[PDB]
Structure formats: C-alpha cells, structure tokens
Amino acid sequence: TXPGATXPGV
C-alpha cells in the first residue's frame, strides 16, 4: 500500500 500501509502496485 501507499507508501506506507506502494499502491498497489508501485
């Protein structure tokens, strides 16, 4: 996720 908590995706 995110970041934080990447994306998704990336």
DSSP 3-state of 4: coil
Query: What is the rounded CA–CA span in Å between residue 4 and residue 8?
Result: 11
* Cβ atoms of 9 and 3 closer than 8 Å: no
CA-based radius of gyration for the chain: 5
Query: What is the rounded CA–CA span in Å between residue 10 and residue 4?
Result: 11
Query: What is the rounded CA–CA span in Å between residue 9 and residue 7?
Result: 4
* Cβ atoms of 3 and 10 closer than 8 Å: no
Query: What is the rounded CA–CA span in Å between residue 10 and residue 8?
Result: 6
Q: How many residues does the chain have?
A: 10
CA 6 to chain centre: 2
DSSP 3-state of 3: coil
* Cβ atoms of 8 and 1 closer than 8 Å: yes
